[PDB]
Amino acid sequence: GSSGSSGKIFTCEYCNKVFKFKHSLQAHLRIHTNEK
Ligand SMILES: [Zn+2]
Structure with a gap:
């Protein structure tokens, strides 16, 4: 049996x-950017 699954991906611009x-990428952006 396979060790995991893959397909379409999401890339960090930073x-x-x-x-x-x-949602995995969008949460990772919080190390690169900020909000107020
Ligand atoms: Zn990044």
Whole structure:
């Protein structure tokens, strides 16, 4: 049996790291950007 699953990915515009789901990237952006 397979060790995991892959498909369409989501890429960080700041460090070029890739993720499997949109919310995984959007939460990673909080190290690169801020909000007030
Ligand atoms: Zn990043």
